[PDB]
Amino acid sequence: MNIVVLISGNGSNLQAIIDACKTNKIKGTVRAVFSNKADAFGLERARQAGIATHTLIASAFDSREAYDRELIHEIDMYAPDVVVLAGFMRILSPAFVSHYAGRLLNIHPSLLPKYPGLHTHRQALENGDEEHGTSVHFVTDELDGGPVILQAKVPVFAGDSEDDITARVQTQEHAIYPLVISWFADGRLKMHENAAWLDGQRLPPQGYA
Amino acid sequence: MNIVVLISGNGSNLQAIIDACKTNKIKGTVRAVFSNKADAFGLERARQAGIATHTLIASAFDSREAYDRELIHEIDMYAPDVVVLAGFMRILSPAFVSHYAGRLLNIHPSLLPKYPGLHTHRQALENGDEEHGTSVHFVTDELDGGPVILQAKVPVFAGDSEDDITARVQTQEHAIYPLVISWFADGRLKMHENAAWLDGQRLPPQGYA
Numbered sequence: 207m208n209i210v211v212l213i214s215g216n217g218s219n220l221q222a223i224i225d226a227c228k229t230n231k232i233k234g235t236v237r238a239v240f241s242n243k244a245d246a247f248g249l250e251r252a253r254q255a256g257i258a259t260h261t262l263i264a265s266a267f268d269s270r271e272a273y274d275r276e277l278i279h280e281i282d283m284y285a286p287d288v289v290v291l292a293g294f295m296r297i298l299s300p301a302f303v304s305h306y307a308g309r310l311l312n313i314h315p316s317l318l319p320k321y322p323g324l325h326t327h328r329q330a331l332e333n334g335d336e337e338h339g340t341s342v343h344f345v346t347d348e349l350d351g352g353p354v355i356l357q358a359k360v361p362v363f364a365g366d367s368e369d370d371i372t373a374r375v376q377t378q379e380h381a382i383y384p385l386v387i388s389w390f391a392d393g394r395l396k397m398h399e400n401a402a403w404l405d406g407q408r409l410p411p412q413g414y415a
Numbered sequence: 416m417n418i419v420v421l422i423s424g425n426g427s428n429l430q431a432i433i434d435a436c437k438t439n440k441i442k443g444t445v446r447a448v449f450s451n452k453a454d455a456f457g458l459e460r461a462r463q464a465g466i467a468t469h470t471l472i473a474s475a476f477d478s479r480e481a482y483d484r485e486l487i488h489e490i491d492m493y494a495p496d497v498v499v500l501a502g503f504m505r506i507l508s509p510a511f512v513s514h515y516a517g518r519l520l521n522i523h524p525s526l527l528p529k530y531p532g533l534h535t536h537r538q539a540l541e542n543g544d545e546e547h548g549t550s551v552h553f554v555t556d557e558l559d560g561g562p563v564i565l566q567a568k569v570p571v572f573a574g575d576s577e578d579d580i581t582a583r584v585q586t587q588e589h590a591i592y593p594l595v596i597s598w599f600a601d602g603r604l605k606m607h608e609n610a611a612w613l614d615g616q617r618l619p620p621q622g623y624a
């Protein structure tokens with residue numbers, strides 16, 4: 207089972223995935239890690255693990271379509287069974303989403319449908335929500351509109367800073383992402399009729415309950 | 416629980432609603448029926464049931480805003496708890512949608528998002544669909560774009576005419592519309608964050624599953 211991970215920054219989720227393959231919780235391997243930022247430390251995590259790395263700078267391309275195309279061309283050298291977005295700060299084109307339909311995953315730092323887009327933690331905290339979390343879902347063209355597979359809620363108390371809750375959510379992300387990937391790896395997770403299905407059963411709008 | 420129905424034609428769905436209130440499946444009453452067509456037989460259905468009727472002709476108004484305004488003014492004489500569109504062939508203005516936000520329902524003759532608008536049936540046959548149906552949803556300014564509450568699928572077999580399928584879908588409509596209205600009447604159905612919620616639970620893009 208070949209996994210290709212796409213990142214943009216630190217890559218703590220990438221690390222959790224790497225560790226899960228190592229323990230075999232995930233019966234597969236991370237074949238490659240792609241980044242749109244040359245600096246991303248995640249690349250360094252993959253490097254140290256003997257995993258291949260690649261970098262595609264948006265400037266070197268003259269259109270989003272041209273960029274994803276070279277991305278698809280590159281990612282495919284590894285014959286991935288699933289493409290995983292772990293902190294990938296770049297929106298993917300419909301062509302790309304199409305090419306990996308049903309096998310493209312992402313983990314959004316909020317309790318979807320709440321706060322699609324960037325700056326989740328802040329909004330959650332500035333709006334005064336008593337509950338925050340993360341959501342792993344199948345990627346569709348709609349910015350975080352795809353079928354939610356699993357969420358991990360996290361209590362929000364007075365006094366918690368933006369970083370406090372962020373580190374709290376992160377701890378959950380490291381738990382549910384590798385898990386969702388393992389479900390996928392065992393052919394227990396699929397998507398059709400734009401819905402997410404676990405063990406053959408339809409999952410609710412907010413993921414496995 | 417006061418219900419105000421808006422129609423344009425025969426009113427078979429109106430009748431199903433009327434019958435459901437009679438049996439108390441819906442714990443409420445159709446207080447009035449409005450139509451934008453003087454001929455609509457639905458008016459006679461209501462008439463025979465001892466229900467009040469009203470007609471508002473578009474020609475008698477010089478703008479859509481003026482028309483809905485008078486519509487709101489009239490509908491409100493009946494202090495409705497919910498306004499139900501049953502075959503109403505007229506697009507309502509934002510102000511109107513706003514005034515009945517969360518308490519305005521419609522039943523579209525197709526499996527939304529597929530075939531928003533008119534000519535559902537014909538497109539289904541034409542586009543060679545193996546499945547057709549109806550969708551009850553909360554009304555928002557987006558033409559059949561609001562939160563779908565419940566759909567009723569219907570199989571399509573070679574040999575089926577546009578009338579064969581239409582009559583098949585109608586039969587379903589008479590079943591799910593009164594049902595959805597009862598959910599609403601029991602305070603079990605609500606809309607917030609532009610989503611449909613049944614028994615406190617968020618419903619999928621396709622309605623209750």
Ligand SMILES: Nc1nc(O)c2cc(C[C@@H](C(=O)O)c3ccc(C(=O)N[C@@H](CCC(=O)O)C(=O)O)cc3)ccc2n1
Pocket residue numbers: 291294295296297298299300303312313314315322323324345346347348349350351352
């Ligand atoms: N088609 C598609 N659908 C999704 O749901 C995607 C989901 C993701 C991750 C997502 C996160 O979980 O939240 C996410 C959502 C939004 C942006 C963004 O706007 N980034 C750029 C803007 C556009 C770009 O440069 O790509 C910025 O600098 O603000 C970056 C990641 C990435 C690509 C996606 N692509």
Ligand SMILES: Nc1nc(O)c2cc(C[C@@H](C(=O)O)c3ccc(C(=O)N[C@@H](CCC(=O)O)C(=O)O)cc3)ccc2n1
Pocket residue numbers: 500503504505506507508509512521522523524531532533554555556557558559560561
């Ligand atoms: N604001 C609003 N939003 C919706 O979603 C509505 C949904 C409905 C029913 C709908 C059905 O599901 O099918 C529906 C779909 C299309 C037309 C239409 O084009 N009507 C006019 C156009 C303009 C007018 O009303 O004068 C015509 O003569 O084609 C009328 C109702 C009626 C009014 C609505 N109003």
Ligand SMILES: NCC(=O)N[C@@H]1O[C@H](COP(=O)([O-])[O-])[C@@H](O)[C@H]1O
Pocket residue numbers: 213214215216217218219220291292293294295296313314315340376379
């Ligand atoms: N564009 C994707 C996105 O929203 N990523 C989010 O940014 C953080 C980076 O974690 P990381 O250590 O896994 O890189 C994670 O919390 C992840 O959900």
Ligand SMILES: NCC(=O)N[C@@H]1O[C@H](COP(=O)([O-])[O-])[C@@H](O)[C@H]1O
Pocket residue numbers: 422424425426427428429501502503504505522523524549585588
């Ligand atoms: N614009 C509304 C609309 O498309 N309504 C649809 O027209 C038919 C009329 O039924 P009826 O008059 O016998 O209830 C119904 O099938 C309804 O879904």
